[PDB]
């Protein structure tokens, strides 16, 4: 029995919030915190979440619950179809936490932190190539970005962005075609680009725009947030918020002891323990999330920003990629371990995207060992009965699986897949014989040109809030970890965001074709959709998961003091 969104998104607390209070929040992470306050230089969900009280890496725009931009946040955005432009207007009273002004240059500077390769960002995308002049800036052909202009100068509040083509997602946060954050140029301008990611000024001592500012950061561990007096909006109720990492093994005990009021990111396997805690209300919602299995198919040319699908491997054969997908027992694993919160995915577009997900698309959600065996046969991988593995030209079908650390069942689940692959005559071993630590895995995946010492890996994403996956899979994106490059897929991705896709009927058809083609080519295999849950101590007032709730850090409080 899969649980449905029949969780509550809000804890509607009838007790009044006090003036002051010290809220304690944790993110479940077995890896150390990676503090990076600049959105362009940060790749991980853990810190993006922990940065929330500080403004979420200085996000600019408010949205509704469907992620559509609305007016009244730190900035407004207006589109003009026929000029092919966006105009971003920063609030007159938008300030940094040192009291300095947020200006137009701070918005343009975000684009430089990603597009100028001297900063070492991993967030270049083909989506950004759609801004006039930005590709030429990115390659060093131009020293400025011609498509970004300032109607009232660099120290004004207005920025105009010129596009090559408009994209249907532009009405929605997470679209990727224009950026949504500011970076404090006056604070950071003297830091050499290569040094910016490791500077105290982007790690332990940042400037921020949110309702709280990080008074202290303990590297790898925690943030002490206090109210930011220069915040333009609603003054917070709380005196402080501490935000800390907590290990998977210590999470449940930290709720029993009231150490944390809220823990974010808790694994499906712990839900049975958490649901029984009388001092807590458990909130939940469909996760803006996908997990997937990647195949290593090439390398990344960083100088020229292109994934090159040139790796010599049996995984270049579609039948082999498909077989390895069909062999997994994802449903069996989810049924045993996930407490009904993980559902085997049929495609890469998760159910939260209700219009553009396709429930009738068939993927690898059902194990089919017979089909897997047939595919390998027909591709010439014949079973050596003496060994129980398949061969070609005396070469064994042997692969390396870079499985990751996780919860108490991670090694068991990885081994369960290795055993399923043995049933289809594929020999699979763990990378260096053990599960990979997360921060190490991220480095291994993102560092150009890519490694050649793995074949299969698992990734999972806190997805951008607009369903287009250009920024996961486009030919120029370092986030395409397996480095596939396929003209059919590139056309599919582009068609989803075409002018014709301003019509939602046409865009739906485009999303369906993309979902089908990705499953057929099998460069990646969708793994799981999830429901997320969040325990909240009963003393917390004004907590809600509603995606349309824009002022929660200012509104949230406590009804009694912590012991």
């Amino acid at each position: 029995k899969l649980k449905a969104g029949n969780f509550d998104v809000a804890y509607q607390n009838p007790d009044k919030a006090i003036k002051g209070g010290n809220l304690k929040v944790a993110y479940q992470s077995d890896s150390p915190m990676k503090a990076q306050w600049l959105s362009g230089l940060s790749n991980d969900a853990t810190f993006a979440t922990m940065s929330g009280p500080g403004g979420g890496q200085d996000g600019l725009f408010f949205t509704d619950s469907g992620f559509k931009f609305i007016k009244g946040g730190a900035a407004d955005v207006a589109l003009d179809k026929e000029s092919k432009t966006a105009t971003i207007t920063l609030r007159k009273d938008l300030k940094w936490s040192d009291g300095s002004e947020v200006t137009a240059k701070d918005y343009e500077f975000t684009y430089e932190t990603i597009a100028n390769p001297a900063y070492g960002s991993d967030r270049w995308t083909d989506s950004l190539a759609n801004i006039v002049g930005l590709s030429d800036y990115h390659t060093g052909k131009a020293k400025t970005i011609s498509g970004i202009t300032f109607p009232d100068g660099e120290n004004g509040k207005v920025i105009k962005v010129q596009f090559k083509e408009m994209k249907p997602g532009m009405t929605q946060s997470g679209n990727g075609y224009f950026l949504e954050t500011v970076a404090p140029y006056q604070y950071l301008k003297d830091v050499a680009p290569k040094d910016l990611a490791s500077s105290p000024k982007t790690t332990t001592k940042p400037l921020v725009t949110g309702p709280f500012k990080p008074e202290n950061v303990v590297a790898g561990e925690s943030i002490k947030y206090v109210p930011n007096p220069y915040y333009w909006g609603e003054k917070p109720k709380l005196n402080s918020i501490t935000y800390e990492v907590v290990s998977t093994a210590k999470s449940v005990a930290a709720l029993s002891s009231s150490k944390y009021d809220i823990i974010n990111g808790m694994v499906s396997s712990q839900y049975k323990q958490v649901k029984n805690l009388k001092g807590y209300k458990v909130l939940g919602q469909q996760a803006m999330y996908i997990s997937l299995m990647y195949y290593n198919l090439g390398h990344y040319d960083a100088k020229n920003s292109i994934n090159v699908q040139d790796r010599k491997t049996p995984l270049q054969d579609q039948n082999v990629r498909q077989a390895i997908g069909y062999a997994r027992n994802v449903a069996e694993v989810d049924n045993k371990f996930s407490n009904g919160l993980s559902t085997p995915a049929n495609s890469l577009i998760p159910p939260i995207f209700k219009q553009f997900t396709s429930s009738s698309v068939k993927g690898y959600e059902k194990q089919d060992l017979d089909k897997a065996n047939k595919l390998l046969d027909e591709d010439g991988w014949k079973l050596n009965k003496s060994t129980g593995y398949r061969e070609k030209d005396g070469k064994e079908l042997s692969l390396v699986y870079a499985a990751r650390v996780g919860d108490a069942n991670a090694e068991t689940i990885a081994q369960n897949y290795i055993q399923q692959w043995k049933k289809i005559g594929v020999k699979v071993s763990l990378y260096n014989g053990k599960l990979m630590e997360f921060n190490s895995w991220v480095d291994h995946m993102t560092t150009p040109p890519g490694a050649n010492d793995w074949d299969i890996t698992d990734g999972s994403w806190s997805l951008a809030s607009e369903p287009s996956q250009q920024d996961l899979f486009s030919a120029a994106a370092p986030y395409n970890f397996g480095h596939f490059n396929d003209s059919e897929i590139t056309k599919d991705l582009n068609d989803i965001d075409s002018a014709k896709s301003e019509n939602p009927t046409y865009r739906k058809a485009a999303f369906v074709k993309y979902q089908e083609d990705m499953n057929k080519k099998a460069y990646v295999i969708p793994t799981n959709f999830m429901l997320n849950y969040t325990p909240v101590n009963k003393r917390v007032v004004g907590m809600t998961l509603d995606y349309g709730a824009m002022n929660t850090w200012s509104e949230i409080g406590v009804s009694s003091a912590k012991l």
Binding site: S39, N43, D44, S460, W461, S462
Partner: peptide
């Protein structure tokens, strides 16, 4: 979220 971010699980 406003961007794609890598999750530990």
């Amino acid at each position: 979220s406003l961007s794609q971010s890598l999750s530990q699980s």
